């Protein structure tokens, strides 16, 4: 699904870049033709601004999908790294809490000795 979505958006991102480049070229040519002496049709034109925001929207959607997948994969690998299941989670949380107590003790002592 996260890999699948990344595949789905990539053709769209290429399409959005193509339109944004083409629309920019049409707008610049019309503006240069109006600024210099050169007749040009009013036409549909299509606004450059609308295309540039669309490209940014697709970029955010892709980054959000990848960031979630990376976070989910990192959490899974860490979970594997660390008889009944309730006692299992109990001893895990106990080890983590005792490590945190050691942390707090070292911190408070090293901060009370000086500074």
């Amino acid at each position: 699904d996260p890999v699948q979505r990344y595949k789905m958006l990539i053709p769209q991102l290429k399409e959005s870049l193509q339109t944004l480049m083409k629309v920019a070229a049409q707008n610049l040519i019309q503006n240069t033709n109006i600024d210099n002496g050169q007749k040009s049709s009013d036409g549909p034109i299509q606004r450059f601004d609308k295309c540039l925001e669309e490209f940014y929207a697709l970029c955010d959607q892709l980054e959000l999908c990848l960031r979630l997948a990376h976070e989910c994969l990192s959490q899974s690998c860490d979970s594997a790294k660390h008889l009944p299941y309730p006692q299992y989670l109990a001893v895990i949380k106990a080890q983590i809490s005792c490590a945190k107590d050691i942390h707090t003790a070292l911190l408070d002592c090293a901060n009370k000795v000086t500074g």
């Binding site: 080890q95 983590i96 005792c98 490590a99 050691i102 003790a105 070292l106 002592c109 000795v113």
Partner: protein
């Protein structure tokens, strides 16, 4: 007196960094009984480290407050460029240690000869 307190201050500042290094190594080896031992070791290290701070501080105060009469010459004016009964006690101790070192050298020579002989015999017996 003061020249030895300065050496004490030197050894304290040379040992505090080693103590911090040992503390870093202990925190590194602490992966998640043995936890109690690691904790009490870290606490003892911290206490001895604070004691070392206090010792280096007090020896600093001592060497700073001493400032004996014979210090009018600033640094770089002291380096030599091109252009009683204490000595008798030193000589006596030197003669004594020289005799003891000669005797110890004789003992070491005899021990080396013994070991070489035993090794040669136990090697040739095969």
């Amino acid at each position: 007196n003061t020249a030895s307190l300065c050496r004490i201050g030197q050894e304290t500042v040379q040992d505090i960094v080693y103590r911090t290094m040992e503390i870093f190594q202990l925190l590194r080896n602490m992966q998640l009984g043995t936890y109690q031992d690691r904790l009490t070791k870290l606490q003892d290290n911290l206490r001895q480290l604070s004691v070392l701070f206090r010792k280096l501080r007090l020896v600093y105060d001592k060497c700073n407050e001493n400032c004996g009469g014979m210090d009018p010459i600033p640094v770089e004016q002291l380096i030599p460029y091109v252009e009683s009964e204490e000595r008798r006690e030193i000589a006596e101790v030197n003669k004594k240690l020289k005799q003891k070192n000669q005797q110890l050298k004789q003992i070491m020579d005899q021990l080396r000869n013994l070991i070489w002989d035993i090794n040669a015999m136990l090697a040739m017996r095969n």
